[PDB]
Amino acid sequence: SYSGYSQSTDTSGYGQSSYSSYGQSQNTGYGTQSTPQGYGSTGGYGSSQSSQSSYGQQSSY
Amino acid sequence: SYSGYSQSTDTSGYGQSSYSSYGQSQNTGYGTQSTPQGYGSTGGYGSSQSSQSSYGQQSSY
Amino acid sequence: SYSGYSQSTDTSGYGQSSYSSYGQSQNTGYGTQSTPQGYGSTGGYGSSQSSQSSYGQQSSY
Amino acid sequence: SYSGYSQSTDTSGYGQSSYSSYGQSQNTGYGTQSTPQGYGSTGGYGSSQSSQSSYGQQSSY
Amino acid sequence: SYSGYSQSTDTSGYGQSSYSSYGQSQNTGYGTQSTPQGYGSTGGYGSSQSSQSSYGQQSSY
Amino acid sequence: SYSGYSQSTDTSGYGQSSYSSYGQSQNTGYGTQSTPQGYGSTGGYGSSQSSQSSYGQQSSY
Amino acid sequence: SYSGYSQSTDTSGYGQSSYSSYGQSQNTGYGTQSTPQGYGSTGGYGSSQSSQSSYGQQSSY
Amino acid sequence: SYSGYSQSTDTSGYGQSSYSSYGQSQNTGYGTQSTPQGYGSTGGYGSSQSSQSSYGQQSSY
Amino acid sequence: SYSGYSQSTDTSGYGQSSYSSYGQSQNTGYGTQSTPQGYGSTGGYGSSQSSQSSYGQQSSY
């Protein structure tokens, strides 16, 4: 809570990734994937009191 | 809560990613994926008290 | 909580990965994978009191 | 909690991996794999009191 | 809790691995594997009191 | 808890492995393997009081 | 707990192995193997009081 | 607990092995093997009081 | 507990073995073998009070 530097929180979506490809190459993201549901990536330091759920996630067929 | 630097929170959508491709190359994002539902990426540090849910997410067919 | 440096938390989505490929090469992300559901990647240091669940995750067929 | 450096926590998604491939080569991510469900990668140092579960994860058929 | 350096915790997803391949070579990630469920990779030093379970993980058929 | 250096804990996913291959060579990850379930890789030094289980893990058929 | 150096704990996934192969060679990971279930690789020095179990692990058929 | 150097504990996954192969050669990991279940590789010096079991491990058929 | 140097404990997975092969040669890991179950490789010096068992380990058919 006190003195925070380089604070970066990310559940999905290339949190911290660069130079995926260079020159001739096929750059394709994740593709098929289901991210959280409800409190995806709990950020905002201080207090996180919640409740959620998910049952039926599908990506690409 | 006190002294915050480089504070960046992102659940999905390339949180911190650059130089995905260079020159000849096919740059394709994630493609098929379902992000949170309700409190996606809890930011705004201070307090996060909520409740949600989701059951029936589909991406591309 | 006091004095924080290089603080980076990421459950999925290439937390900290660079130079995946260079020049001629096929850069393909994860592909088929299901990330958390509810409190995916618990960040925001301070307190995390929640409850969730998920039973029915599918990626690519 | 006091004096933190090089603090990086990641359950999946190449936590800390670079130079996966160079020049002619096929760069393919994990492929088929199911990440946590509920409290995937418990970060945000301070306190983590939760409960979750998951029974029915599938990746690629 | 006091004085922390080079603190990096990762359950799966190449925790700390670089130079997987160089030049002509086939770079393939794990492939088929199921990561934790519930409290995957317990990070955020301070206290981790939770409970979870999972019975039905499948990767690639 | 006091004075910590080179602290890196990883259950699976090449904890600390580099230079897997060089030049002409087939770089293939683990392949078929099931990681923990519940409290995979107990990190965050301080206290870890939990309970979990898993019976039905399969990787590649 | 006091004065810690070169502290690295890893149950599976090449804890500390480099230069697996060089030049012409087939680099293949473990292949078929099931890692712990519940408290895989008990890290986070301080206290580890838990209970778990697993009966039904399979890797590759 | 006091003054710790070169502290590295690993149950499986090449704890401390390098230069597995050089030049023309077939580098194959363990292959078929089942790692612990429950408290695989008890690390985090300080105290480890738990209980677990496993009866039904199979690797490759 | 006091003054520890070159402390490395590993039950399986080439604890401390290097230069397995050089140049033309077939580098094959253990192959078929079942590692502990429950408290595999009791590390974390300080105290280890647990109980476990396993009856039904198979590697490769």
Side-chain angles (χ1 to χ4, degrees), chain I residues 5-55:
Chain I
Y5 298 91
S6 300
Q7 198 282 332
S8 179
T9 300
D10 313 297
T11 276
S12 193
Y14 294 83
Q16 324 190 319
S17 170
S18 299
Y19 299 93
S20 294
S21 66
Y22 179 83
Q24 182 178 356
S25 42
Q26 290 171 330
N27 180 263
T28 299
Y30 255 52
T32 73
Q33 155 165 303
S34 296
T35 2
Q37 258 87 229
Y39 249 61
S41 207
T42 315
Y45 46 81
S47 161
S48 306
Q49 181 177 352
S50 30
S51 179
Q52 36 271 129
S53 68
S54 165
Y55 34 89

Side-chain angles (χ1 to χ4, degrees), chain D residues 4-26:
Chain D
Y5 298 91
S6 300
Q7 198 282 332
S8 179
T9 300
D10 312 297
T11 276
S12 193
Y14 294 83
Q16 324 190 319
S17 170
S18 299
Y19 299 93
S20 294
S21 66
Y22 179 83
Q24 182 178 356
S25 42
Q26 290 172 330

Side-chain angles (χ1 to χ4, degrees), chain F residues 12-41:
Chain F
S12 193
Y14 294 83
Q16 324 190 319
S17 170
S18 299
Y19 299 93
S20 294
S21 66
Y22 179 83
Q24 182 178 356
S25 42
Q26 290 171 330
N27 180 263
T28 300
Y30 255 52
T32 74
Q33 155 165 303
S34 296
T35 3
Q37 258 87 229
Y39 249 61
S41 207

Side-chain angles (χ1 to χ4, degrees), chain A residues 11-14 29-37 57-61, chain B residues 11-13 30-36 57-59, chain C residues 11-14 29-37 57-61, chain D residues 12-13 30-35 37 58-60, chain E residues 35:
Chain A
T11 276
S12 193
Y14 294 83
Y30 255 52
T32 73
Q33 155 165 303
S34 296
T35 3
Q37 258 87 229
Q57 301 290 117
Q58 291 172 331
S59 297
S60 198
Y61 201 92
Chain B
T11 276
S12 193
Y30 254 52
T32 74
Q33 155 165 303
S34 296
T35 4
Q57 301 290 117
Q58 291 172 331
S59 297
Chain C
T11 276
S12 193
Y14 294 83
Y30 255 52
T32 74
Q33 155 165 303
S34 296
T35 3
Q37 258 87 229
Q57 301 290 117
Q58 291 172 331
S59 297
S60 198
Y61 201 92
Chain D
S12 193
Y30 255 52
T32 74
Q33 155 165 303
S34 296
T35 3
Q37 258 87 229
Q58 291 172 331
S59 297
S60 198
Chain E
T35 2

Side-chain angles (χ1 to χ4, degrees), chain E residues 25-50:
Chain E
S25 42
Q26 290 171 330
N27 180 263
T28 299
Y30 254 52
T32 74
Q33 155 165 303
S34 296
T35 2
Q37 257 87 230
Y39 249 61
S41 207
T42 315
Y45 46 81
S47 161
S48 306
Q49 181 177 352
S50 30

Side-chain angles (χ1 to χ4, degrees), chain H residues 14-46:
Chain H
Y14 294 83
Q16 324 190 319
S17 170
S18 299
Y19 299 93
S20 294
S21 66
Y22 179 83
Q24 182 178 356
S25 42
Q26 290 171 330
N27 180 263
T28 299
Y30 255 52
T32 73
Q33 155 165 303
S34 296
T35 3
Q37 258 87 229
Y39 249 61
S41 207
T42 315
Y45 46 81

Side-chain angles (χ1 to χ4, degrees), chain H:
Chain H
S1 198
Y2 295 89
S3 300
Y5 298 91
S6 300
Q7 198 282 332
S8 179
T9 300
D10 312 297
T11 276
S12 193
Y14 294 83
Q16 324 190 319
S17 170
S18 299
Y19 299 93
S20 294
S21 66
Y22 179 83
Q24 182 178 356
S25 42
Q26 290 171 330
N27 180 263
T28 299
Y30 255 52
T32 73
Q33 155 165 303
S34 296
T35 3
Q37 258 87 229
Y39 249 61
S41 207
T42 315
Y45 46 81
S47 161
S48 306
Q49 181 177 352
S50 30
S51 179
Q52 36 271 129
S53 68
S54 165
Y55 33 89
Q57 301 290 117
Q58 291 172 331
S59 297
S60 198
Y61 201 92

